[PDB]
Design an enzyme around this catalytic site. Structure first.
Site, PDB file in Angstrom:
ATOM      1  N   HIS A  41       0.814  -1.228   0.000  1.00  0.00           N
ATOM      2  CA  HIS A  41       0.000   0.000   0.000  1.00  0.00           C
ATOM      3  C   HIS A  41       0.842   1.271   0.000  1.00  0.00           C
ATOM      4  CE1 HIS A  41       0.008   0.286   4.536  1.00  0.00           C
ATOM      5  NE2 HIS A  41       0.035   1.563   4.212  1.00  0.00           N
ATOM      6  N   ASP A  90      -0.790  -7.374   1.593  1.00  0.00           N
ATOM      7  CA  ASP A  90      -0.112  -6.096   1.706  1.00  0.00           C
ATOM      8  C   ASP A  90       1.392  -6.332   1.922  1.00  0.00           C
ATOM      9  OD1 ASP A  90       0.264  -3.341   1.805  1.00  0.00           O
ATOM     10  OD2 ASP A  90      -0.617  -3.121   3.801  1.00  0.00           O
ATOM     11  N   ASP A 179       0.933   0.501  20.152  1.00  0.00           N
ATOM     12  CA  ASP A 179       0.529   0.041  18.813  1.00  0.00           C
ATOM     13  C   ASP A 179       1.542   0.511  17.793  1.00  0.00           C
ATOM     14  OD1 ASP A 179      -1.240  -1.252  16.964  1.00  0.00           O
ATOM     15  OD2 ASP A 179      -2.790   0.298  17.151  1.00  0.00           O
ATOM     16  N   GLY A 183       2.792   5.863   9.434  1.00  0.00           N
ATOM     17  CA  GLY A 183       4.189   6.138   9.258  1.00  0.00           C
ATOM     18  C   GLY A 183       5.104   4.910   9.461  1.00  0.00           C
ATOM     19  N   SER A 185       4.044   1.750   8.459  1.00  0.00           N
ATOM     20  CA  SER A 185       3.736   0.702   7.467  1.00  0.00           C
ATOM     21  C   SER A 185       4.957   0.289   6.698  1.00  0.00           C
ATOM     22  CB  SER A 185       2.676   1.147   6.458  1.00  0.00           C
ATOM     23  OG  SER A 185       1.401   1.350   7.095  1.00  0.00           O
ATOM     24  N   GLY A 186       5.027  -1.024   6.462  1.00  0.00           N
ATOM     25  CA  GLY A 186       6.124  -1.648   5.736  1.00  0.00           C
ATOM     26  C   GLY A 186       7.291  -2.117   6.598  1.00  0.00           C
TER      27      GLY A 186
END
Ligand SMILES: Cc1noc(C)c1NC(=O)NCc1cccc(-n2ncc(C(=O)Nc3ccc4nc(N)[nH]c4c3)c2O)c1
Ligand SMILES: [Ca+2]
Ligand SMILES: [Cl-]
Lengths: 247, 57
Positions: A41, A90, A179, A183, A185-186
């Site tokens: 994404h 993803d 959590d 920022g 992601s990946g």
């Protein structure tokens, strides 16, 4: 990352920062000297595919200390089953234009065999998630790399405690305190077993973060090991984006 | 054997026909004569943190 701590410089040496026109795009995970795993994404809206940069050895984004290594992203490979703007499948595999040089501050995370990951790693309760993402929901991103220990849930238990597919897993906390966040992601979900760390998840996404009643969602990397391995044996193709059949 | 306790392997495990099992190691590691343990063969093997490995060297 919400409710974690600064990853001491050099202790998350597989962490990647992805930039597009110098701006923070996403995280990633180094798995070999030319290969980075990230989230599909991250690339849904890229216009100029030739301005993507991966940075290894990064820690404090405010300074240059000489341990950073930047490379152009030569290929972004995404599974055919991924639909832009969604969560399922993803994952992205990125080929760098030139290898990074391994150093005390730049080290790949081991991509495990599928069997080992399914039979053994999937039952290790806590794993580390890291990134330069938001420190709070609707807050500023971090300048120093952050890390958080999160526990993994079985998917039946995720659904009860909250569509999570077989290509995902939940991990983290339902009390809004800790959590992954926008920022991040990946970036890696790394799992320790008998003295070595392995890639088991990729930070995916959700609407906001640190939301009471909701866990973070991670791409279940064990489903993709064979797909990744075959692609890493393949020759590069002209054009940065490549959609590759999955399975 | 591999489904229980990782077959006793530090890293990867394969079942063979019979009461047989073979452990294996990732690239950058070699298998010791115990048939289970993996030791680095390069300076920067995957999944190890150099500044912590040197804190214990
Ligand atoms: C096609 C399309 N149609 O609609 C959209 C929306 C499309 N795609 C794009 O616009 N793609 C572009 C793009 C690129 C990079 C990041 C982002 N990006 N934007 C928001 C987030 C985010 O909230 N992430 C995140 C992370 C960790 C989390 N942990 C928890 N609990 N929650 C979390 C949430 C993120 O990652 C989007
Ligand atoms: Ca820096
Ligand atoms: Cl192109």
């Amino acid at each position: 990352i919400v409710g974690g701590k600064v990853c001491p410089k050099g202790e998350c040496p597989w962490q990647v920062l992805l930039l597009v026109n110098g701006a923070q795009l996403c995280g990633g995970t180094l798995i070999n000297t030319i290969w980075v795993v990230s989230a599909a994404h991250c690339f849904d809206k890229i216009k100029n595919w030739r301005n993507l940069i991966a940075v290894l050895g990064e820690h404090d984004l405010s300074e240059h200390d000489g341990d950073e290594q930047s490379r152009r992203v030569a290929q972004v490979i995404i599974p055919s089953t991924y639909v832009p703007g969604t969560t399922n499948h993803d994952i992205a595999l990125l080929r760098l234009h030139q290898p990074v040089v391994l150093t005390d501050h730049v080290v790949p995370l081991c991509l495990p065999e599928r069997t080992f990951s399914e039979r053994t790693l999937a039952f290790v309760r806590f794993s580390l998630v890291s990134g330069w993402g938001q420190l709070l929901d609707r807050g500023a991103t971090a300048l120093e790399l952050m890390v958080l220990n999160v526990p993994r849930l079985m998917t039946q238990d995720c659904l009860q405690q909250s569509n999570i597919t077989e290509y995902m897993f939940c991990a983290g906390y339902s009390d809004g305190s800790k959590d992954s966040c926008k920022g991040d992601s990946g970036g890696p979900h790394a799992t320790h077993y008998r003295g070595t760390w392995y890639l088991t998840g990729i930070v995916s996404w959700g609407q906001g973060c640190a939301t009471v009643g909701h866990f973070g969602v991670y791409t279940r990397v064990s489903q993709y090991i064979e797909w990744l391995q075959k692609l890493m044996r393949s020759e590069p193709r002209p054009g940065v984006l490549l959609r590759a059949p999955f399975p | 054997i591999c489904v229980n306790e990782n077959g006793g392997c530090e890293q990867y495990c394969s079942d063979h026909t019979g009461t047989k099992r073979s452990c294996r190691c990732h690239e950058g590691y070699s298998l010791l004569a115990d048939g289970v343990s993996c030791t680095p063969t390069v300076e920067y093997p995957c999944g190890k943190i150099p500044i912590l490995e040197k804190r214990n060297a």
